[PDB]
Design an enzyme around this catalytic site. Structure first.
Site, PDB file in Angstrom:
ATOM      1  N   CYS A   8      -5.205  28.393  35.737  1.00 40.09           N
ATOM      2  CA  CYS A   8      -4.507  27.695  36.839  1.00 40.09           C
ATOM      3  C   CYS A   8      -5.539  27.585  37.978  1.00 40.09           C
ATOM      4  O   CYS A   8      -6.580  26.920  37.748  1.00 40.09           O
ATOM      5  CB  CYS A   8      -3.218  28.438  37.198  1.00 40.09           C
ATOM      6  SG  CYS A   8      -3.426  30.216  37.466  1.00 40.09           S
ATOM      7  N   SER A   9      -5.295  28.230  39.115  1.00 47.18           N
ATOM      8  CA  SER A   9      -6.256  28.346  40.249  1.00 47.18           C
ATOM      9  C   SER A   9      -7.079  29.628  40.082  1.00 47.18           C
ATOM     10  O   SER A   9      -8.223  29.564  39.543  1.00 47.18           O
ATOM     11  CB  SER A   9      -5.532  28.306  41.583  1.00 47.18           C
ATOM     12  OG  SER A   9      -4.364  29.122  41.569  1.00 47.18           O
TER      13      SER A   9
ATOM     14  N   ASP B  48       5.128  23.211  43.393  1.00 47.89           N
ATOM     15  CA  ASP B  48       4.162  23.663  44.429  1.00 47.89           C
ATOM     16  C   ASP B  48       4.614  25.023  44.966  1.00 47.89           C
ATOM     17  O   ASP B  48       3.746  25.893  45.144  1.00 47.89           O
ATOM     18  CB  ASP B  48       4.033  22.634  45.557  1.00 47.89           C
ATOM     19  CG  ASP B  48       3.491  21.300  45.081  1.00 47.89           C
ATOM     20  OD1 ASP B  48       2.512  21.301  44.318  1.00 47.89           O
ATOM     21  OD2 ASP B  48       4.070  20.280  45.454  1.00 47.89           O
TER      22      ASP B  48
ATOM     23  N   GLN C 186       2.135  37.410  39.115  1.00 43.72           N
ATOM     24  CA  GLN C 186       1.912  37.667  40.553  1.00 43.72           C
ATOM     25  C   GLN C 186       3.214  38.021  41.287  1.00 43.72           C
ATOM     26  O   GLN C 186       3.146  38.850  42.207  1.00 43.72           O
ATOM     27  CB  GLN C 186       1.235  36.444  41.163  1.00 43.72           C
ATOM     28  CG  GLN C 186      -0.261  36.473  40.929  1.00 43.72           C
ATOM     29  CD  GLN C 186      -0.907  37.558  41.759  1.00 43.72           C
ATOM     30  OE1 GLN C 186      -0.911  37.476  42.992  1.00 43.72           O
ATOM     31  NE2 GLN C 186      -1.445  38.571  41.089  1.00 43.72           N
TER      32      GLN C 186
ATOM     33  N   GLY D  83      -1.666  34.373  38.232  1.00 42.74           N
ATOM     34  CA  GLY D  83      -0.203  34.166  38.396  1.00 42.74           C
ATOM     35  C   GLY D  83       0.429  33.260  37.336  1.00 42.74           C
ATOM     36  O   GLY D  83       1.068  33.782  36.394  1.00 42.74           O
ATOM     37  N   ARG D  84       0.221  31.953  37.437  1.00 44.02           N
ATOM     38  CA  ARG D  84       0.723  30.964  36.448  1.00 44.02           C
ATOM     39  C   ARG D  84       0.152  31.303  35.073  1.00 44.02           C
ATOM     40  O   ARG D  84       0.927  31.416  34.088  1.00 44.02           O
ATOM     41  CB  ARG D  84       0.378  29.547  36.898  1.00 44.02           C
ATOM     42  CG  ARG D  84       1.186  29.057  38.089  1.00 44.02           C
ATOM     43  CD  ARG D  84       0.883  27.601  38.346  1.00 44.02           C
ATOM     44  NE  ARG D  84       1.116  27.195  39.723  1.00 44.02           N
ATOM     45  CZ  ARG D  84       0.835  25.995  40.197  1.00 44.02           C
ATOM     46  NH1 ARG D  84       0.263  25.093  39.416  1.00 44.02           N
ATOM     47  NH2 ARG D  84       1.081  25.707  41.461  1.00 44.02           N
TER      48      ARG D  84
END
Ligand SMILES: Nc1nc(N2CCC3(CC2)Cc2ncccc2[C@H]3N)cnc1Sc1ccnc(N)c1Cl
Length: 485
Positions: free
Chosen positions: A419-420, A385, A466, A424-425
């Site tokens: 990812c979202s 997380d 990111q 980033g990921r």
């Protein structure tokens, strides 16, 4: 454009004083937070006073307190400056003179080391600037023009610092090395006998032979990692490409984050209503970098997978993290069949591993049974997380499996990664995959260039990779992969 409004080496006190003495109402700069490392601070002057506004980045996006979420600080600063309201106004960037984050600046580097690098890694027009050991406060500009035949050479130019201004012994006196370097890039020094000192590109010191990764990581760990990353970050101002399509009224609701948009020139266009927040990534495997589906884009997601002949989806988020929705469930329950508009999907079978679930999905167009193909969904479930994994083993084992699956399917289209926000990921997974891919084909004797590869991926989707923590984890992943061959 410029990213001179970012001050890498400034405290919150120094920033206030800089804005109160050398700035005016509507002046601004951005900087690292001293009190929340990994985060940043927008420092604006209004009514003869300074407001400090927090920018958080945990790995997904840059979250501006009382503002929006952005793929880069440059896209953030462009948005507010183009009043596209924060009321607080970003009018006047306050420029940094610190050269720390220029590609061409090598700080306290010896003339000995300088000449090795230029000789071995340099080509025609390769240049660097370093602190002078001889003359404290001065600098040396060194430029290669043209290894046995003496058809090339290195010219050294002393740069004098006199009363806070920089010069090469005659002509203009500049307020910063950057000004000095930009002037002589445009108006090159010429030598008595004709040689033009072309400043054509900074010397490349980031490209390494793969075998030296452990060595480069040890060097970066004593701090070289922060220097190399912030230098990459400073180059993001070159990647402010148009995202007009994502800003059309009828496309606003199709974006998970209003201001994190696909570049027009690399967006996936849906044919046979044309829009999805997704970009083709070409490094040879190619990729689609996209966001977690919203309720109203599940149908579009499946039109994209079908259209692009994608046979592998990589999901690098849970549906829910820290009680927040990151991605709508866009796959049927195991053994179930669903229609998503004109696209029909069967969940044939799920297999669970520690770090991931694999869903074997059959995707077809309703009406046409002959359009069926298997799409393999690799759902990574153990990403933390906060931050990045302490060990890269699970991510490398995952990617190795994804790579073999993709290689096993003749004419497979790009690999879908999300990812979202899908920057980033998603960026981190795609850069690890590309770098390992090189080493897999071209072996332990190959060149890799982490920041070159990230800059190339950031040219195709805003803010791919990111954080500095992701940047470090990429180096760690490539090192671990090299150590087990
Ligand atoms: N991340 C990058 N790093 C560097 N290095 C390492 C960091 C230093 C400049 C040289 C060395 C140094 N040493 C001491 C103090 C401060 C500093 C930094 N300025 C150079 N360029 C990039 S970005 C890059 C690379 C390769 N290709 C493309 N396309 C792009 Cl955009």
């Amino acid at each position: 454009t410029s990213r001179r409004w970012f001050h890498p080496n400034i405290t919150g006190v120094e920033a206030e004083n800089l804005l109160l003495t050398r700035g005016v109402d509507g002046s601004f700069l951005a900087r690292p937070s001293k009190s929340n490392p990994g985060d940043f601070t927008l420092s604006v002057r209004r009514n003869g006073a300074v407001t400090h506004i927090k920018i958080q980045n945990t790995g997904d996006y840059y979250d501006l307190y009382g503002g929006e979420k952005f793929a880069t600080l440059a896209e953030l600063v462009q948005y507010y400056m183009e009043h596209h309201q924060l009321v607080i106004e970003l009018k006047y960037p306050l420029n940094c003179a610190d050269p720390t984050s220029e590609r061409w600046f090598h700080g306290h580097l010896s003339g000995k080391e300088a000449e090795k690098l230029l000789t071995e890694k340099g080509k025609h027009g390769s240049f660097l600037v370093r602190e002078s050991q001889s003359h404290p406060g001065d600098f040396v500009l060194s430029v290669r023009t043209g290894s046995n035949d003496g058809k090339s050479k290195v010219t050294h130019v002393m740069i004098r610092c006199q009363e806070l201004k920089y010069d090469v012994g005659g002509g203009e006196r500049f307020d910063s090395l950057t000004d000095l370097v930009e002037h002589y890039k445009k108006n090159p020094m010429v030598e008595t006998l004709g040689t033009v000192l072309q400043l054509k590109q900074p010397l490349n010191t980031t490209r390494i032979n793969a075998a030296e990764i452990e060595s480069r990581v040890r060097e970066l760990s004593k701090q070289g990692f922060w220097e190399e990353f912030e230098t990459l970050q400073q180059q993001e101002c070159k990647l402010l490409y148009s995202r007009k399509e994502g800003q059309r009224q009828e496309n606003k609701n199709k974006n998970r984050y209003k201001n994190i948009l696909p570049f027009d020139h690399t967006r996936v266009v849906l044919h046979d209503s044309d829009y999805i927040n997704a970009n083709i990534i070409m490094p040879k495997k190619s990729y689609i970098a996209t966001q977690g589906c919203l309720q109203n884009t599940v149908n579009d997601f499946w039109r994209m997978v079908f259209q692009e002949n994608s046979r592998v989806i990589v999901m690098t988020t849970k549906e829910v993290e820290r009680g927040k929705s990151k991605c709508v469930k866009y796959w049927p329950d195991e053994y179930a069949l669903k229609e998503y508009g004109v696209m029909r999907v069967r969940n044939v079978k799920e297999s669970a591993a520690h770090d991931y679930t694999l869903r074997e999905l059959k995707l077809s167009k309703v009406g046409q049974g002959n359009t069926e193909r298997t799409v393999w969904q690799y759902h990574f479930r153990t990403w933390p997380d906060h931050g990045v994994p302490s060990d890269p083993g699970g991510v490398l084992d995952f990617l190795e499996e994804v790579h073999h699956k993709q290689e096993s399917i003749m004419d497979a289209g790009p690999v879908v990664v999300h990812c979202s926000a899908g920057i980033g990921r998603t960026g981190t997974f795609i850069v690890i995959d590309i770098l390992i891919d090189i080493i897999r084909e071209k072996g332990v004797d190959c060149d890799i260039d982490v920041p070159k590869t990230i800059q190339m991926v950031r040219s195709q989707r805003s803010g791919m990779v990111q954080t500095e923590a992701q940047y470090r984890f990429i180096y760690m992943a490539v090192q671990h992969y090299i150590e087990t061959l």
